[PDB]
């Protein structure tokens, strides 16, 4: 199983200056619950924007730099190595890799942030003619989750 895992705003912004534009602890829990015990694959820029591999799951970084080496990260050097990865594999970022993978993945777990942020990194355009909506769950607003958001699980038609 090969999935995308992304949070993007109303205009598909996912990042701004190496940072997430919004603070949404519920979506952090969503990511932990979905990806704990499985594989995250990310581009080099996405990985270095995080700075450390995420605990309790496999961390795979795609780069052409053959000296790249981090404690806790397995390196791949081509898209084609993604297909050799076992288990449930989530493509985690960034814009480039999503552009490389959005036409290949089985499904997408999207968190839609119901906001318009300033961004410099974008998720690819997609249309619901190609994706059926398996589930659509509103996030609960509260104390620390101040922005409306919605958990979509989209499956390719």
Ligand X SMILES: NC(=O)C1=CN2[C@@H](CC1)O[C@H]1[C@H](O)[C@H](COP(=O)(O)OP(=O)(O)OC[C@H]3O[C@H](n4cnc5c(N)ncnc54)[C@H](OP(=O)(O)O)[C@@H]3O)O[C@@H]12
Q: Which of ligand G8J, ligand X, none does residue 21 bind (CB under 5 to 8 Å by kind)?
A: none
Quick one: 154 exposed, middle or buried, by C-beta within 10 A (0-12, 13-18, 19+)? buried
Task: Tell me if 121 is assigned to a ligand binding site.
Answer: yes
- Residue 19 pairs in a beta bridge with 16
CA distances from 138 to 20, 21, 25, 155 (A): 20, 20, 14, 18
Q: Which of ligand X, ligand G8J, none does residue 65 bind (CB under 5 to 8 Å by kind)?
A: ligand X
Query: Which has the closest alpha carbon to 85: 109, 66, 53, 60?
Result: 60
Query: Which has the closest alpha carbon to 40: 13, 80, 73?
Result: 73
Nearest distance, CB of residue 72 and ligand G8J, angstroms: 13
Cβ distance to ligand G8J smaller for residue 7 or 66: 7
C-alpha span between 102 and 107 (Å, rounded): 9
**What number of H helices and E strands is found in the chain?**
3, 10
Which residue has the CB atom at the shortest distance from ligand G8J? 7
Q: Which of ligand X, ligand G8J, none does residue 31 bind (CB under 5 to 8 Å by kind)?
A: ligand G8J
Residues of span 102-141 touching ligand G8J by CB under 6 A? 111
The binding site for ligand X (CB under 6 A) comprises: 14-15, 18, 20, 42-46, 49, 62-65, 77-79, 93-97, 100, 121
The binding site for ligand G8J (CB under 6 A) comprises: 5-7, 18-20, 27-28, 30-31, 46, 49-50, 54, 92-93, 111
């Amino acid at each position: 199983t090969l999935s995308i895992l992304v949070a993007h705003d109303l205009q598909r912004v996912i990042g701004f200056e190496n940072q997430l534009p919004w603070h949404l602890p519920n979506d952090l829990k969503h990511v932990k619950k979905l990806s704990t015990g499985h594989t995250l694959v990310m581009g080099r820029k996405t990985f270095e924007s995080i700075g450390k591999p995420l605990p309790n799951r496999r961390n795979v970084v795609l780069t052409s730099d053959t000296s790249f080496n981090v404690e806790g990260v397995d390196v791949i050097h081509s898209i084609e190595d993604i297909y050799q990865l076992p288990g449930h594999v989530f493509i985690f970022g960034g814009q480039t890799l999503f552009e490389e993978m959005i036409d290949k993945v089985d499904d997408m777990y999207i968190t839609v942030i119901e906001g318009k942020f300033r961004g410099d990194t974008f998720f690819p355009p997609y249309t619901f003619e190609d994706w059926e909506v398996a589930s659509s769950v509103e996030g609960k607003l509260d104390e620390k989750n101040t922005i409306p958001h919605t958990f979509l699980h989209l499956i390719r038609k």
